[PDB]
């Protein structure tokens, strides 16, 4: 059982800059002067894509900015100029000794200029209220960096811990994030209060933007 150890575990790099990922093996992965280390790219939802086989050999249909080097126990994947779509997790893979083993993974992220989010609030459907629950949704669309607060206020009353958040991975084109926050109440509790509001905070915002709605209005 050879233990592959990638370095770093994640790196952030500006768009167009070089990006190097190391992978050191506990023992040699070579035989007859051929190194059996292979590199993979995996994006959310998808299986691993083979970039580089036996150490340095570039696969068909893979950009030539992807390159590979090394031997014995020390190997390196290099992306000469990082593009927006290259945001992924990258894995090394030995196939010299049974069992085949994989590296821990290296997350690659793009650094880019700040972008303020587009906030949208969505009131609950009549359908859902009929079934006796209210889900109020607040969408923060296309922003960088990732860090953003979202406070839920109901008649200017700070809500506490009856909501969940979720964040998309970095976009393959604009290299931004999106976030959705869902306030879940009962129909009973929903219909007591009038104003439902979503206070956002971000770097791109000079001060907190708030989107709100009144309950029996449009």
């Amino acid at each position: 059982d050879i233990v592959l150890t990638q370095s770093p575990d994640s790196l952030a790099v500006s768009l167009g800059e070089r990006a190097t990922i190391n992978c050191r093996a506990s023992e040699s992965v070579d035989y007859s002067g051929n190194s059996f280390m292979h590199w993979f790219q995996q994006k959310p939802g998808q299986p691993p894509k083979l970039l580089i086989y036996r150490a340095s050999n570039l696969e068909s249909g893979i950009p030539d900015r992807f390159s590979g080097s090394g031997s014995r126990t020390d190997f390196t994947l290099t992306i000469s100029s990082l593009q927006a779509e290259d945001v992924a997790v990258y894995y090394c893979h030995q196939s010299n000794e049974d069992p085949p083993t994989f590296g821990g993974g290296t997350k690659v992220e793009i650094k880019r200029t700040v972008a303020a989010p587009s906030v949208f609030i969505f009131p609950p459907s009549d359908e859902q209220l009929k079934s006796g629950t209210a889900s109020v949704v607040c969408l923060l669309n296309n922003f960088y960096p990732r860090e953003a607060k979202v406070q839920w206020k109901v008649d200017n009353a700070l809500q506490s811990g009856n909501s969940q958040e979720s964040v998309t991975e970095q976009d393959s084109k604009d290299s931004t994030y999106s976030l959705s926050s869902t306030l879940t109440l009962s129909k009973a509790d929903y219909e007591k209060h009038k104003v439902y509001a979503c206070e956002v905070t971000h770097q791109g915002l000079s001060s907190p933007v708030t989107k709100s709605f009144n309950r029996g209005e449009c």
Partner: peptide, 19 residues
């Protein structure tokens, strides 16, 4: 399009949004 990853609710059922 942005399909968000699912969140496990305290009910034990999952829930996601697509916008």
């Amino acid at each position: 399009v942005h399909t968000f990853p699912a969140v496990l609710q305290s009910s034990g059922l999952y829930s996601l949004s697509s916008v």
